[PDB]
C-alpha cells in the first residue's frame, strides 16, 4: 500500500542544477524522518540527507561529500520530498533512492547523469535467427544509447513467455540487449528512453 | 562512525547457513539495518534495530550482534535470497552505509545452450553490424566466449554482460555482442561463438552470410 514516486531525474550538465521529487503515498507524511540514498553506477550505497519531522523543527544532516552543495527540503501539506542539488560535480552521477526512517519503505530511485556529453537516443535493431535455422528464441539489441536507464518491455501474442533483461555495457556510450525464449507468432520490444523515446520494433 | 563489513563475496548451496558480520569504528548501540538488494531493483529491510525482524522477511533471516560488531546468520539458504547485503547504523551523523556482500547461489554446474543472431540489414545500411550470441542457462558464471571471424580469433571489440542468478533456477546467463564495420562484414564470410567451460569442448553456433 505504501509507495513511493521518484520523478524529475537525467541528464544535467556540470556546475548545474537538478531539483528531484519524492512523490509519497499510502502513510502518513508529516509523522515520518525522511532520508535520501544514493548509488554510484556499480558501487555500493551511499547516504546523502535526511530531514526531520516538524514536531523537531525540521532538523536536515547532510553527509560531507555534499555538504554546502545540496539542499533537501519537504512539503507536509502535497506529502512530497524534496531534494535541491546544486553546484553539480561529475562524482555525483548516481540513482537516487528516496526512503523513510531506518529504510522501511524505499522508491523505484532516479538515475541522475552529470556529464558534458549529451543524450543520444538509443537505435534498436531487430535480432532474429537466418531463415532455415528456425529457434525457440529471439531477442532485440539497444546500441548507442545514452544516458541510463533505457526501459526495454516485452509484449507478445502467445500467453507464456520467457524475457530475461542483460546489463547495460557501457560508461560513454552504453548498450544492451534482451532476449525472449519461445514457450508455450509474433513479438515487439517497447524501449523507452527517459527523454522521451516511445519506441518500438517488431519481430515476426 | 564508519562500517567495515565482511565478507565481500559469499557462496554456499540451498540450505547452507551463512553469516555476514559488519563491524563499526565505535559503539553504534543496535543501531544497524540490513537491506536486501537484488540486481537493478530497490534495496528492501531485511533486520532493524540489531536483531528485530521486519514484517513480511521470513524467520529464517535470523539477525544478531551487539555492542561494536554485528552479524547477520540465514540458515535454510533459499534460492531466491542472491544479490548484496548492506549494514547501515542510526547512531550517529552521518547514517554510514555497508561494504556489501554478493552472497551466490552454489549450484551443481551446468553447460550453457548456445544461440548466434545475424545482424540486421537495418544496422548494415547504418554503416556498422554487430552479431550477437545469447547463452543462456549455465552454471558457473565464468565462461570464455571466444568470437570467430573465418577461423580467426577476435577478441579485440567485444561487450560481454551476465545476468543476475535466476531466481529459481539459480543459473547465470550472459550475452556477447562482436561489433565490427560493414566492410568488414563483408569481407569475411564464416562468423562462429565459441563458449568454453564445464567440459573442454566449446558448445558452437556458427553462421555464414549466405
Known amino acids: 500500500e505504501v509507495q513511493l514516486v521518484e520523478s524529475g531525474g537525467g541528464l544535467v550538465q556540470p556546475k548545474g542544477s537538478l531539483k528531484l521529487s519524492c512523490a509519497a503515498s499510502?502513510?502518513?507524511?508529516?509523522?515520518?524522518?525522511m532520508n535520501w540514498v544514493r548509488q554510484a553506477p556499480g558501487k555500493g550505497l551511499e547516504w546523502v540527507a535526511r530531514?526531520?519531522?516538524?514536531?523537531?523543527?525540521?532538523?536536515?544532516y547532510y553527509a560531507d561529500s555534499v555538504k554546502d552543495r545540496f539542499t533537501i527540503s519537504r512539503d507536509d501539506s502535497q506529502s512530497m520530498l524534496y531534494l535541491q542539488m546544486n553546484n553539480l560535480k561529475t562524482e555525483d552521477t548516481a540513482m537516487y533512492y528516496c526512503?523513510?526512517?531506518?529504510?522501511?519503505?524505499w522508491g523505484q530511485g532516479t538515475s541522475v547523469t552529470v556529464s558534458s556529453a549529451s543524450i543520444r537516443n538509443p537505435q534498436l535493431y531487430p535480432l532474429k535467427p537466418c531463415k532455415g535455422t528456425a529457434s525457440m528464441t529471439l531477442g532485440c539489441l539497444v546500441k548507442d544509447y545514452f544516458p541510463g536507464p533505457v526501459t526495454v518491455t516485452w509484449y507478445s501474442d502467445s500467453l507464456n513467455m520467457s524475457t530475461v533483461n542483460f546489463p547495460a555495457l557501457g560508461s560513454e556510450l552504453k548498450v544492451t540487449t534482451s532476449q525472449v525464449t519461445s514457450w508455450g507468432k509474433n513479438f515487439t520490444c517497447h524501449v523507452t528512453h527517459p527523454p522521451s523515446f516511445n519506441e518500438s520494433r517488431t519481430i515476426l | 562512525i564508519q562500517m567495515t563489513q565482511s565478507p565481500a563475496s559469499l557462496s554456499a548451496s540451498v540450505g547452507e547457513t551463512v553469516t555476514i558480520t559488519c563491524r563499526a569504528s565505535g559503539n553504534i548501540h543496535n543501531y544497524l539495518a540490513w537491506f536486501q538488494q537484488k540486481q537493478g531493483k530497490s534495496p528492501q529491510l531485511l533486520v532493524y534495530n540489531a536483531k528485530t525482524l521486519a514484517d513480511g522477511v521470513p524467520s529464517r533471516f535470523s539477525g544478531s550482534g551487539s555492542g561494536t560488531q554485528y552479524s547477520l546468520k540465514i540458515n535454510s539458504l533459499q534460492p531466491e535470497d542472491f544479490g548484496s547485503y548492506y549494514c547501515?547504523?542510526?547512531?550517529?551523523?552521518?547514517?554510514?552505509f555497508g561494504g556489501g556482500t554478493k552472497l551466490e547461489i552454489k549450484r551443481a554446474d551446468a553447460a550453457p545452450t548456445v544461440s548466434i543472431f545475424p545482424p540486421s540489414s537495418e544496422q548494415l545500411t547504418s554503416g556498422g553490424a554487430s552479431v550477437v550470441c545469447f547463452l543462456n542457462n549455465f552454471y558457473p558464471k565464468d565462461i570464455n566466449v571466444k568470437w570467430k571471424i573465418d577461423g580467426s580469433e577476435r577478441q579485440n571489440g567485444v561487450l560481454n554482460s551476465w545476468t543476475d542468478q535466476d531466481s529459481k533456477d539459480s543459473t547465470y546467463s550472459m550475452s556477447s555482442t562482436l561489433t565490427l564495420t560493414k566492410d568488414e562484414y563483408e569481407r569475411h564470410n564464416s562468423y562462429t561463438c565459441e563458449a568454453t567451460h564445464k567440459t573442454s569442448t566449446s558448445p558452437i553456433v556458427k553462421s555464414f552470410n549466405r
Open positions: 526512503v523513510r526512517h531506518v529504510g522501511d519503505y
Open positions: 547501515q547504523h542510526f547512531w550517529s551523523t552521518p547514517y554510514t
Open positions: 499510502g502513510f502518513t507524511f508529516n509523522t515520518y524522518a
Open positions: 530531514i526531520r519531522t516538524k514536531t523537531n523543527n525540521y532538523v536536515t
